Symmetry: D2
Amino acid sequence: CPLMVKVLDAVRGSPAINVAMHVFRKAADDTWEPFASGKTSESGELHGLTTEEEFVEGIYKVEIDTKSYWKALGISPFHEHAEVVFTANDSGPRRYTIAALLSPYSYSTTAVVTN
Amino acid sequence: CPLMVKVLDAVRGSPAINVAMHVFRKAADDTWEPFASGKTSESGELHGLTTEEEFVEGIYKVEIDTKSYWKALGISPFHEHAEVVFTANDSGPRRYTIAALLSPYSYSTTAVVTN
Amino acid sequence: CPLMVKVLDAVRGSPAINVAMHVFRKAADDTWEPFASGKTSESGELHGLTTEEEFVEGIYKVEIDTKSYWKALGISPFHEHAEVVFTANDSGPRRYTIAALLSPYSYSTTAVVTN
Amino acid sequence: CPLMVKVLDAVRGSPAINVAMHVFRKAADDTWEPFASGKTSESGELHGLTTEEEFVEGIYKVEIDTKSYWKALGISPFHEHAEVVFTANDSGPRRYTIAALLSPYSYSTTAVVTN
């Protein structure tokens, strides 16, 4: 995959399953255009968001609906969502894995960029 | 201080000094209205963003310009910025400390909410 | 304060209050010698562990009893404790702040070192 | 795998490759007995540490030699190593993935416990 997202739940020690997210690409007029979306699987992963041909250099935003996830467990969380905004290489295609670790009042994100 | 932000640098083991950030409040037309801005001090903290009277219920966004911070140190980081989006004061006035821990390819953010 | 520890609770969005910890120093026979202990305050901080004169060069271990903290809240956590092992003062005296962010199945620890 | 470890580098945005670690099991006299060891692969993963039959309930310690990893990149890090101490279910076998995210002055660990 050019772009994969993995989401983990630090309260339960498990993948974060059925988490919805949307991916946007910054349009030339500096507005966010829908690009891809999906929900995580039972492994907490979302694959198949895009293809190499389609995933060109640009500024992308991944918006993860963490609030609905916590509300489903009966927890009132702090964040409205988790956002990850990045430039996809200013030097050609590459493979991006975005990981997100969720708690009700905290999240961390990392990127793994391999070849 | 109804709203304080603290930023740490996980590469150097230091406060993140002179990091710019912008705070926005979601307006009635569902656009982001600029609310406050500033830079962190030598302790990595930004105080004095707002008062109890001005900090009403609403949805707020804190945008931390992490890319300029890393670029000044010679590092091309992954994220364009770190964003924190949250509802504030929906059960009455609270005090919010937002902490952010920065690395070039990862960040964590954590909120402490006191009454 | 040559050595201070701050502990936050990522589930509740609060300082982690009344968390016990034990500090050890590696002795000449390569065993751990008990150095200092205490509990965090209502601000989640533990001050006053040592003085500049007593805090000599060496290898130190901070053991934070996170399991008792979670169990008191009804949660069976993953870790037995959180441990931080580091060399201190090997380039001369420094001030160390150790921060720990706790969730039941995850923790993060971060050091700020100032001269 | 009953027990797998994955290590990521938050400075470079990559798997942490060739990181050495040792696993210990607490002996009945409260001493740490060597149990397994290995180095991470090019994917930052270490598989094949143990088998279901051998991995019985107990207290285990994973000691990750993060200091050698950073020194190989020319960085003087804070921690001597990263330690993860846990009880392997007080209610039978299960599958454990331990993830560790490394920076020079910070690390985070999480556990994913699936069935």
